[PDB]
Amino acid sequence: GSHSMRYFFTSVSRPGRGEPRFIAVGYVDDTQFVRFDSDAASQRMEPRAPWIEQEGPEYWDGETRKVKAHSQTHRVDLGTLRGYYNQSEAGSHTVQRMYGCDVGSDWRFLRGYHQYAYDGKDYIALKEDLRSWTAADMAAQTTKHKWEAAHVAEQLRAYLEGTCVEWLRRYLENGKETLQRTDAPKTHMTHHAVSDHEATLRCWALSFYPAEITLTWQRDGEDQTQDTELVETRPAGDGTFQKWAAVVVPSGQEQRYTCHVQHEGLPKPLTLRWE
C-alpha cells in the first residue's frame, strides 16, 4: 500500500493578548504521532502515538529544538505579511504551512510537497518538480524571489526526497502493527419508516483503517449520487474511522437498491441489499 508523512503548522496572531499561537502536528497516513503547542506548559515536541514513545531523548530534544525555531519564523512571518498587504496591527491573522512526502507501494519516493497559505488562501507552493514556485500574488512573488535567491527549493528537495522518505520508512517499520495494518470495515444496514409511503435506508461502514473508502448506493445498478446523503469520513476516536450513506426509498422498493463498499482491506468489493 501507498503511504505518506505530513507536517501541519498553524500560526495565529493575537493583537494585545501576547505572542501568536503556534501549533504543529505530525501524521503518518491517518495516524497523528507528534505535536507542539506554544500555549502548552512543557514547551516541547510531544508523542501522540505509542510507537514513537520509544524514540530516545536525542529525538525529542532535537525535534523540540527545530519546532520552536519554526515557531519563531512564523512569528516573524506574521509581521512581514501584515506589511506586505498593509493591514492594521489590531486584526488577528492566520498562516498555515504544510509539507511532506508520498511513497508508493514499494515504499519508493513518489511525490513531495510544501505549501503555504495566508488567512486561508493559497500564497505560495512548491511545484511538483521541486525546482519551481507558484506565487499567486505580488506579495507572494516578493517571497518567491527571496526563496529563489536563498535556494530554498533545493534544500526542500533534499529533505523531501531524502530524510522525509527515510524517516517515513523507519516509522512504518517501528509502528508496523498500527501503521501497516488494514482493518476492513464492519458493515450493516438500517431501515427506518419516515412516513406511511417512504423509508430511509442507511448503509454503515465501521472501524476501518486507513480512512480511504468508497461507499455508494445504486437503484437497479445505477448510481444514485444526487439522491444520496453521504457524510464525511469521521474518526472513531480509537484510531479507526466511520462513514455512512443513506437514501430515501419509496415503501415497497427496498429490493432494487444496493450499497457498494470499496476498501483496501476487503478482498472483494461488497454489495449489500436490504432483503
Binding site: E63, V67, A69, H70, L156
Partner: peptide, 9 residues
C-alpha cells in the same frame, strides 16, 4: 522528523 529548512517570507 521535521525539516531544518524554514525560509522566512
Amino acid at each position: 522528523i521535521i525539516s531544518a529548512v524554514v525560509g522566512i517570507l
